[PDB]
């Protein structure tokens, strides 16, 4: 399913970057998982992950790197601390299951 994220974002001088990752759902899912992967040299590592029941605030597993806020079908992420950062959205319930993969975000550090 179509996931939209910016092509490029700028990171502040304190190493924190913020971008919006929005997603549409063919149905209306009440149980969503949002993941952020880092892709460099074909291999991918997990930046962070959060589980989302719509309207109940975005709960992140481990807030060491990512803190984010929900507002409908948009998620405003914040990552702290030079590859490609991909926003992943999983519509778990109700069926059907949907996987969404954004086109990736480049992060330039001024």
């Amino acid at each position, epitope marked *: 399913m179509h996931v939209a994220q910016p092509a490029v974002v700028l990171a502040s001088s304190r190493g924190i970057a913020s971008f919006v990752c929005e997603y549409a759902s063919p149905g209306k899912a009440t149980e969503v998982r949002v993941t952020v992967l880092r892709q460099a040299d074909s291999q*991918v590592t997990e930046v962070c992950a959060a589980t989302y029941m719509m309207g109940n605030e975005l709960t992140f597993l481990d807030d060491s790197i990512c803190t984010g806020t929900s507002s409908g079908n948009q998620v405003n992420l914040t990552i702290q601390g030079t590859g490609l950062y991909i926003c992943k959205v999983e519509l778990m319930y109700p069926p059907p299951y949907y996987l969404g993969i954004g086109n990736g975000t480049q992060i330039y550090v001024i």
Partner: antibody
Amino acid sequence: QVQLVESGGGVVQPGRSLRLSCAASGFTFSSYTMHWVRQAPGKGLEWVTFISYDGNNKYYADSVKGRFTISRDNSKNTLYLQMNSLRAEDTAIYYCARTGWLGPFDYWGQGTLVTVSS
Amino acid sequence: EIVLTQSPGTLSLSPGERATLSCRASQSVGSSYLAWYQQKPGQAPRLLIYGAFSRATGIPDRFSGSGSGTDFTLTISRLEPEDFAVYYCQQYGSSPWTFGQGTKVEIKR
């Protein structure tokens, strides 16, 4: 090195039950969704069932809906497949499969054979 | 249900030749949700291509993929003896996860 080893296959009569296991090693088990995929002899691949990271959500193919139950034990790095009310149409190789973080089934077990016949 | 469709049923080529395997989807599926698998007789499937174009780890460069929407392609630029096997495409963007019928690549003689 990612490893999937399934067990519990065997020969069984229609209506009976069989329990399969898939032992995973070489990766953080709870960080990946899992599938069972089956392959009848001489035919193609058919997806059977899917399970979430912790197990909150499970989905099944229509041919097994109501008779198969997928489960996992992240504490023991094991995946399960309780298959009841077996039919001859369930005769196949049952593969244990991991879902990659970008979608595909990136790792497969070597498979365990089940034969349902009267 | 997204029905996948492969062609041909059997490819008859010689070692060193170029193989082109087709996969068709009954409705449009994004490139990020298509994969190709190789299976040799008596062995479990093995991932080659994911995201239509990207190549799995440990897969030689002679394997590549292309296409979007309805029609997808797997290309083997130069067939090696170990490349003669069965190949399956799959969509993994939504449930149920569906596979194609498979395509057999045999040695022509």
